[PDB]
Design a protein around this ligand. Sequence first.
Ligand SMILES: *[C@@H](C)[C@H]1/C(=C/c2[nH]c(/C=C3N=C(/C=C4\NC(=O)C(CC)=C4C)C(C)=C\3CCC(=O)O)c(CCC(=O)O)c2C)NC(=O)[C@@H]1C
Ligand SMILES: *[C@H](C)[C@H]1/C(=C/c2[nH]c(/C=C3N=C(/C=C4\NC(=O)C(CC)=C4C)C(C)=C\3CCC(=O)O)c(CCC(=O)O)c2C)NC(=O)[C@@H]1C
Ligand SMILES: *[C@H](C)[C@H]1/C(=C/c2[nH]c(/C=C3N=C(/C=C4\NC(=O)C(CC)=C4C)C(C)=C\3CCC(=O)O)c(CCC(=O)O)c2C)NC(=O)[C@@H]1C
Ligand SMILES: *[C@H](C)[C@H]1/C(=C/c2[nH]c(/C=C3N=C(/C=C4\NC(=O)C(CC)=C4C)C(C)=C\3CCC(=O)O)c(CCC(=O)O)c2C)NC(=O)[C@@H]1C
Ligand SMILES: *[C@H](C)[C@H]1/C(=C/c2[nH]c(/C=C3N=C(/C=C4\NC(=O)C(CC)=C4C)C(C)=C\3CCC(=O)O)c(CCC(=O)O)c2C)NC(=O)[C@@H]1C
Ligand SMILES: *[C@H](C)[C@H]1/C(=C/c2[nH]c(/C=C3N=C(/C=C4\NC(=O)C(CC)=C4C)C(C)=C\3CCC(=O)O)c(CCC(=O)O)c2C)NC(=O)[C@@H]1C
Ligand SMILES: CCC1=C(C)/C(=C/C2=NC(=C\c3[nH]c(/C=C4\NC(=O)[C@H](C)[C@H]4CC)c(C)c3CCC(=O)O)/C(CCC(=O)O)=C2C)NC1=O
Ligand SMILES: CCC1=C(C)/C(=C/C2=NC(=C\c3[nH]c(/C=C4\NC(=O)[C@H](C)[C@H]4CC)c(C)c3CCC(=O)O)/C(CCC(=O)O)=C2C)NC1=O
Ligand SMILES: CCC1=C(C)/C(=C/C2=NC(=C\c3[nH]c(/C=C4\NC(=O)[C@H](C)[C@H]4CC)c(C)c3CCC(=O)O)/C(CCC(=O)O)=C2C)NC1=O
Ligand SMILES: CCC1=C(C)/C(=C/C2=NC(=C\c3[nH]c(/C=C4\NC(=O)[C@H](C)[C@H]4CC)c(C)c3CCC(=O)O)/C(CCC(=O)O)=C2C)NC1=O
Ligand SMILES: CCC1=C(C)/C(=C/C2=NC(=C\c3[nH]c(/C=C4\NC(=O)[C@H](C)[C@H]4CC)c(C)c3CCC(=O)O)/C(CCC(=O)O)=C2C)NC1=O
Lengths: 160, 161, 161, 161, 48, 160, 160, 160, 169, 169, 48
Amino acid sequence: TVVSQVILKADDELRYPTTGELKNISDFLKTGEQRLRIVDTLTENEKKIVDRASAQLWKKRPDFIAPGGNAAGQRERSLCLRDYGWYLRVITYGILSGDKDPIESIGLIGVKEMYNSLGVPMPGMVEAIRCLKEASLALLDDEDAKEAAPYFDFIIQAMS
Amino acid sequence: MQDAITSVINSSDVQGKYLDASAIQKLKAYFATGELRVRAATTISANAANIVKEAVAKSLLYSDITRPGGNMYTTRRYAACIRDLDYYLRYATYAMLAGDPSILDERVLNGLKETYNSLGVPIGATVQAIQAMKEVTAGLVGADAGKEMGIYFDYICSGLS
Amino acid sequence: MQDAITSVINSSDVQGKYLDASAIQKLKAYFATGELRVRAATTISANAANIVKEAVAKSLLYSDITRPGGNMYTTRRYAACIRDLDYYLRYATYAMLAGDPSILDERVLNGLKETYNSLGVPIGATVQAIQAMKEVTAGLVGADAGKEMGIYFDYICSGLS
Amino acid sequence: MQDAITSVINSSDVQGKYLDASAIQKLKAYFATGELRVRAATTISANAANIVKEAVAKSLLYSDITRPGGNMYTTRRYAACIRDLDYYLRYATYAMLAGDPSILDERVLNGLKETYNSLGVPIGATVQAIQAMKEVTAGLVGADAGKEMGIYFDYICSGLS
Amino acid sequence: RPAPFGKDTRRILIHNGAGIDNQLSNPGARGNAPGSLGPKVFKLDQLP
Amino acid sequence: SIVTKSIVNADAEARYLSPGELDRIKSFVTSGERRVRIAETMTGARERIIKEAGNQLFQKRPDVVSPGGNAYGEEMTATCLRDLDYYLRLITYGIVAGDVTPIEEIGVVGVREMYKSLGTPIEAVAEGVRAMKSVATSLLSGEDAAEAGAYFDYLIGAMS
Amino acid sequence: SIVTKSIVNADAEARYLSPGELDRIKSFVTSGERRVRIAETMTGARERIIKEAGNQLFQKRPDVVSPGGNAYGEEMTATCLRDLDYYLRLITYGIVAGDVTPIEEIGVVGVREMYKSLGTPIEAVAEGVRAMKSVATSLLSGEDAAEAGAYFDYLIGAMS
Amino acid sequence: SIVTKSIVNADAEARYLSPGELDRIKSFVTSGERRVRIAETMTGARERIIKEAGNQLFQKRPDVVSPGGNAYGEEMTATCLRDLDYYLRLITYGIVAGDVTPIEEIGVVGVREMYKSLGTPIEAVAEGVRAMKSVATSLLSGEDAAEAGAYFDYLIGAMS
Amino acid sequence: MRDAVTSLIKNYDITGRYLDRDAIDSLKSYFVTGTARVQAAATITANAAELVKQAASQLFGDLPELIRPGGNAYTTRRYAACLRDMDYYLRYATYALVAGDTDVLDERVLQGLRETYNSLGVPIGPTVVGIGILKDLATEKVQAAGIEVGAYLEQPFDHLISELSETDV
Amino acid sequence: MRDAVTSLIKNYDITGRYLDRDAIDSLKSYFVTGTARVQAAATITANAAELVKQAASQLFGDLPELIRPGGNAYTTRRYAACLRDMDYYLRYATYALVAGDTDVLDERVLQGLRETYNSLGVPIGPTVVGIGILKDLATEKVQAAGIEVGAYLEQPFDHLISELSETDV
Amino acid sequence: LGRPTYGRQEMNSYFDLCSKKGFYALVDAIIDSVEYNEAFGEDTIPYE
Ligand SMILES: *[C@@H](C)[C@H]1/C(=C/c2[nH]c(/C=C3N=C(/C=C4\NC(=O)C(CC)=C4C)C(C)=C\3CCC(=O)O)c(CCC(=O)O)c2C)NC(=O)[C@@H]1C
Ligand SMILES: *[C@H](C)[C@H]1/C(=C/c2[nH]c(/C=C3N=C(/C=C4\NC(=O)C(CC)=C4C)C(C)=C\3CCC(=O)O)c(CCC(=O)O)c2C)NC(=O)[C@@H]1C
Ligand SMILES: *[C@H](C)[C@H]1/C(=C/c2[nH]c(/C=C3N=C(/C=C4\NC(=O)C(CC)=C4C)C(C)=C\3CCC(=O)O)c(CCC(=O)O)c2C)NC(=O)[C@@H]1C
Ligand SMILES: *[C@H](C)[C@H]1/C(=C/c2[nH]c(/C=C3N=C(/C=C4\NC(=O)C(CC)=C4C)C(C)=C\3CCC(=O)O)c(CCC(=O)O)c2C)NC(=O)[C@@H]1C
Ligand SMILES: *[C@H](C)[C@H]1/C(=C/c2[nH]c(/C=C3N=C(/C=C4\NC(=O)C(CC)=C4C)C(C)=C\3CCC(=O)O)c(CCC(=O)O)c2C)NC(=O)[C@@H]1C
Ligand SMILES: *[C@H](C)[C@H]1/C(=C/c2[nH]c(/C=C3N=C(/C=C4\NC(=O)C(CC)=C4C)C(C)=C\3CCC(=O)O)c(CCC(=O)O)c2C)NC(=O)[C@@H]1C
Ligand SMILES: CCC1=C(C)/C(=C/C2=NC(=C\c3[nH]c(/C=C4\NC(=O)[C@H](C)[C@H]4CC)c(C)c3CCC(=O)O)/C(CCC(=O)O)=C2C)NC1=O
Ligand SMILES: CCC1=C(C)/C(=C/C2=NC(=C\c3[nH]c(/C=C4\NC(=O)[C@H](C)[C@H]4CC)c(C)c3CCC(=O)O)/C(CCC(=O)O)=C2C)NC1=O
Ligand SMILES: CCC1=C(C)/C(=C/C2=NC(=C\c3[nH]c(/C=C4\NC(=O)[C@H](C)[C@H]4CC)c(C)c3CCC(=O)O)/C(CCC(=O)O)=C2C)NC1=O
Ligand SMILES: CCC1=C(C)/C(=C/C2=NC(=C\c3[nH]c(/C=C4\NC(=O)[C@H](C)[C@H]4CC)c(C)c3CCC(=O)O)/C(CCC(=O)O)=C2C)NC1=O
Ligand SMILES: CCC1=C(C)/C(=C/C2=NC(=C\c3[nH]c(/C=C4\NC(=O)[C@H](C)[C@H]4CC)c(C)c3CCC(=O)O)/C(CCC(=O)O)=C2C)NC1=O
């Protein structure tokens, strides 16, 4: 959130937070009930999303389900369906916090090489989040589609 | 560093579930008190050389401690003592801005209890100076936000004693 | 000539005190009934003339008070009694929106009482008419507002008698 | 007195028709500028006495008018002048929120061509005090409203001459 | 000479007396005596 | 309207507009889109409103259409059907202006003396205003029937 | 308050409370929690306001404490600061009541003839209440210091 | 500004512009028309603020004006109004920028070494800018005086 | 008579000042619309003799009290006089459209018009409807010619409505 | 680093003046484009990791004289270093697009860049073509995103061209 | 009342009152107004 950007920004310069960020703190804290229109409409519509994007991935790139792929067995596909709603959980942490600080330190720092420790390649899993964005933004209303769209958009850049 | 926003992120993430109703009742309480805490953090920083002055001029000057013999006789002890009381007030306002005392657990109460007995610093006098600094601060910001520092001023005094 | 806000000011201006929490409790009981009083004002706006008619058709106009021999018989005495039963209501909802009978103390009760002892207007018919106006007000605005409407009518019954 | 809301109503009523789409479109042009007018009123009424003080020192003080012989000599004729400039400021801000100078045709500019002649007030100094008042209230309210404030000052300024 | 006057208009009048003591500025000052500038106000005190 | 009613109240006290009065204009100007949307439902469906409330008045008071009445016959009823066009035009002028003075100067002041000279019963045409309140609330929303219906309850007490 | 101001102005015309001004009673009486919360900050910090504006007043005017003036020793300076506490009570009474009218009934309308009779200088009291504004608005938030600053501005206009 | 401070923080982590600072900046730039009509009124009344806070300072601190103080004499007390002319001029740069990096780089970072080298008391300026705040909050409306008054309150914390 | 330029002259002449920054930007606001003013004034006079004929037949088909023997448009002595007295409202609306403000309308047509029609028995009522049928229309031939339309091209027409018709509210 | 606001501060600070009418209208000209600045900066970072990949494959398909063993983009030691050294030009173009002027580009990326590339043998030539391919391939995703485009968002880029490349004429 | 009439709505309220009630309530309605009683009092001769 915005508040841990400011305290960790004012500790090493040894100074109180000035008005340039205290106006920036108070502007985030009046937008909670605007952001809470987005966070529950992702929440109870989770299972509608989680396989509408999962069918969207394999109709676009079927090699993770192809024999010799990654989720060719059911114990991998049960893992990979779980990771969508894990990514839908941490994205909704970011829309609540309004920043990057939960979405950094849970599911984004170091994923570029620790999928490579597993079998799953990187840029197909970039396609999994990009189809998950349009599976969620079609469910979202349009005037608040543009607010939650950069939070999905950061995961595309940081993973690829 | 754990904000009260990020504290209920982490307590929801250790269960791996989404935000429930009782978690959101911590956020919507915290989103309600946003403008109150920002008004307090301005007027402390405009008075942070006077809150640190009227705390020590009330409780510690002309005492045993400013007199020759104990712990604030020389000027370098006085400069070190006003360095602490400035730093307690500067670290109390972050917990007022966060709404969580995890700043005080991480950045203040780590080595401080061990290094005061190791230096011969009277804990019983510096638990009183922060206690004297509370009702200066509760008068300087207004008693609605004066009941907000009292959690985080005495979180130091709960840890340092 | 003053409302419930400045009543608990003037109740607390004397003996020098400030607004204590019992006095704030009296203010909070007026503020939560702010929704009930103003829609009770607009309910009797549209039916101000019919409520004078339906009061006197229930009680007054078939008796010997309106017969010759009585005192509501001629039209110049009919026009004043139908002016009074209008203006008893027209100051009642002024006192209902204010929140005390202090309006009724200063512009109903100090002059209307000893006038009727010197005019020969009968006064037991008035309280018999203001009770007939009391039940038909609660039958028009609803019983949620009538139980606090009738105390202002019963202030007129207490002072006229 | 014609509000800019009521001027569209008085236009649309005398034709007999209801509210057209074009007549609704004029009110939305007023309502989009409604924030800019109500900002300008509250930033004046806090310091309406200060604008009067800053306008007499710009154009009227240390002149022939405030000297003996002039018309702002002998403080009967000076306290009347300072409230006179208070009148134009108070009636410009009513004409601001009305969005229509119809107040100034009714309550301001009736006698002021003849009452200043019939009191010996020089119009050539109060028409410059108005323009000096516009040049300080454009700096006090802002560059955007001060053009639109300056419409209703120059309606008074052309009405005096 | 007619003139089309409005629905509500205020004729501007001059206070016969003190200049600031017009009632349009201060309505709480109209009960005052006008003093030496205005005319003589009479009142009844002594009844025989 | 709202401001020119509050200007002429602020002129008799000889004072600028209070900050307790200026936020009334500030709230009314920002809530200007909603009250216009109330007004188009009055104008766009007014042939339903007069014809239903005209039927409701002649059932609540059948003495008007009787012989020896004011609105008797085809012609004389047609202006009583047209007088309710006039009062409904003042309500839809009133909710746009937000106040009572566009209604008060046009239809409220002389109305005790007007219908006195024309021979109609004044409260009977005032009863049809009360029936016109009931139909105009039936085509209206939850909050909008309470706000726009308050001027309807002005007008029944205006004539009575 | 605004209730009695909308009753006295409704009684001189003898009208039944036109629904333009009943919307004022809708937003006065429901919004009393905002206004009484300003009064808790003044009453809760009563002992700080008077003492911090006491010595600030005596710095501006050292004639008053010094012998020759009107407050010598502890005894007259105690009632000097009690006299400010009569006004801090009165500003608290004006904040709850919406407008200025419970102050002229208590503390305005004889204060020039009073203080001339007691021998105290009238404008030195006006420096005291001006010093009380300089501490109270620092304690208060900015959107509420316009409201409390109006009643503090009146009292300087009352004594001077 | 805030836009420099959002870039410079995002440049240090070497990522792109976050969805956090995309919305701090967008909320700044849609408040950009509001802050300039705050900052114009300071510059539109700069001769009144300097004259009133100059009147407000010297009665609070008469050791300065009295001989042997620093601003003594008609050339020296003209410089102390010029010494406050700069700090009012700097605050209008901070209101426009939305932060205090115009205040910091120009009027903060070497103040106590300079004013010790000039002979003036440092805390006497901190009363004067605080007295300059008390006439600036009487200019603006209430919701803007909390914004522009915070930039005054930053400058007090740099002095003392 | 009195242009928007010359109204800004004696808005500045009587206070004795030069042309400042506000004078140089309000006058440029008039000149950027001057191409749209003149080309709208051409197409208003494209069929201006037809434009009064389409309006009054749309008037008298809307208010048929003014044809049947009632208020004065009864004979062709009245009706052809009505079309002429309509045509002044179209012709003077062309002038103030070009002139910027309405001060040409203020002292050529509006002064005495409440007193001329009262002396004849001509109603002021449907005259407001007669300008109300033109100001909305006039906009049709500006729209069908391709010129934008809105701020002005009504600036003149409802100044013939809000100042001619008597104030009710 | 140095915003268009803060560049106008020390355009006015060094002469010791307040904010006049020219300051109040040039700064409003920045703020009316600020909605168009930020939403263009979102969609530039929509596929910014893809946008360098589409540009450099369109670069090296256009100038093979940088794939075959010649100038230094030969191995993946060079090529993945080339995609990173391309990606700084995209990332710093986002900052100055939001910041208004190019002073963020002036003292973060441009200073020393003639002297870093000469010390390595990296040519300055196709780097200008690499920003010139990013010149129009940034405008495509602003155009397909519905943002208007114009000098803003097509300027940061040629300030990386007209000041990095050496002057010929 | 010692002043001229104030405008039009202040005079239209008097013209209908002598149209219905007569002259005897016109001279009443001037006297029991607030502007007579609170600006002159109940024991003063009126003055202009
Ligand atoms: C039926 C309602 C009762 C009744 C009434 C009746 N009233 C009068 C005369 C007067 N009543 C008043 C009333 C008021 N004066 C006030 O100031 C207030 C407070 C608002 C009130 C309610 C006044 C002034 C009069 C005198 C009127 C006058 O012009 O003289 C009469 C007397 C009429 C007469 O002359 O005989 C009567 C009979 N009559 C009943 O039967 C009921 C008891
Ligand atoms: C003050 C009224 C009391 C007091 C203070 C005092 N402290 C020291 C020495 C130190 N104080 C600290 C403090 C902190 N370290 C932290 O990380 C934090 C959280 C921000 C704090 C508050 C440390 C590390 C030291 C030792 C190192 C140093 O050089 O200061 C002294 C000096 C002791 C000496 O003998 O010189 C004093 C005087 N002591 C009292 O007497 C008061 C009760
Ligand atoms: C057509 C075969 C028949 C016809 C039709 C007609 N006339 C009009 C319009 C008007 N007619 C008049 C008539 C007269 N004016 C006079 O002064 C006299 C002498 C006393 C007469 C008979 C007038 C003034 C008009 C114009 C006003 C109006 O609309 O009535 C119309 C309407 C035209 C239109 O739609 O604009 C029609 C269809 N006239 C004839 O002569 C034939 C009998
Ligand atoms: C017709 C649509 C409307 C109507 C018109 C009508 N007008 C008249 C007579 C006159 N109209 C004028 C008006 C002007 N003269 C001017 O110089 C100007 C400014 C340029 C105006 C607006 C005048 C002076 C007259 C008198 C005759 C004359 O022109 O000298 C009549 C004739 C009345 C009669 O019956 O003789 C008519 C019918 N009347 C309507 O009903 C329509 C609303
Ligand atoms: C596909 C079956 C065959 C193939 C095709 C291919 N490669 C490229 C692009 C590149 N290839 C290289 C190759 C190397 N880099 C090294 O460091 C080494 C070890 C010495 C090798 C072999 C590089 C750097 C590129 C990128 C630059 C370039 O465009 O050449 C393409 C073009 C891809 C595009 O269009 O963007 C194609 C079609 N590569 C194979 O391995 C298969 C033999
Ligand atoms: C690729 C499309 C082009 C190209 C790139 C290339 N660059 C390098 C090496 C470096 N580039 C930089 C540049 C910057 N560093 C900065 O901090 C900034 C400002 C943010 C810039 C612009 C630097 C410092 C290097 C040196 C390595 C390092 O980053 O530490 C290489 C490597 C050279 C080699 O062969 O080893 C390459 C290939 N070269 C081209 O041909 C294309 C035009
Ligand atoms: C909290 C942040 C976080 C997440 C979400 C996470 C997920 C995660 N995904 C895994 C595997 C996997 N992930 C995938 C995913 C895919 N293959 C494809 O073709 C698709 C593009 C993509 C489909 C969604 C598959 C198939 C496996 C199983 C591979 C294996 O374990 O053998 C594994 C290892 C085994 C397991 O637990 O299932 C972890 C720990 N780890 C983390 O630290
Ligand atoms: C051995 C080294 C040593 C030093 C340096 C020292 C300074 C010292 N000076 C003090 C007070 C003081 N010191 C002064 C002195 C001065 N102010 C003036 O205006 C005079 C010109 C000036 C004299 C140089 C004053 C007035 C106080 C009291 C301040 C107050 O109570 O607010 C106090 C606080 C009271 C106490 O606890 O003692 C300390 C610690 N004490 C020490 O033990
Ligand atoms: C014959 C009746 C009469 C009086 C009294 C009068 C006073 C009067 N005093 C003025 C100014 C002034 N008067 C003073 C006088 C004083 N300031 C102080 O601080 C002291 C308390 C005080 C006297 C000891 C000052 C300083 C000014 C100019 C205001 C300024 O410089 O800002 C002005 C404005 C400029 C001028 O014309 O001089 C008038 C009109 N005019 C009159 O017609
Ligand atoms: C907006 C509506 C309005 C106007 C126009 C107005 C004018 C006005 N000016 C008056 C007096 C005055 N007005 C002035 C004002 C001036 N003479 C000067 O030299 C200066 C140029 C100028 C003001 C700075 C003076 C000097 C008098 C006193 C004349 C006298 O009392 O004989 C009076 C008579 C006393 C009174 O009743 O207040 C009126 C009515 N009052 C109003 O309510
Ligand atoms: C906008 C302000 C306005 C009002 C108030 C108004 C009233 C009005 N009502 C009229 C007639 C009438 N109005 C009625 C109406 C009614 N009679 C009944 O019996 C019903 C109970 C009641 C209505 C439901 C009748 C019967 C007449 C004809 C009276 C007659 O011609 O003798 C007339 C005369 C003919 C006309 O021009 O319509 C006027 C002027 N006109 C206005 O312009």
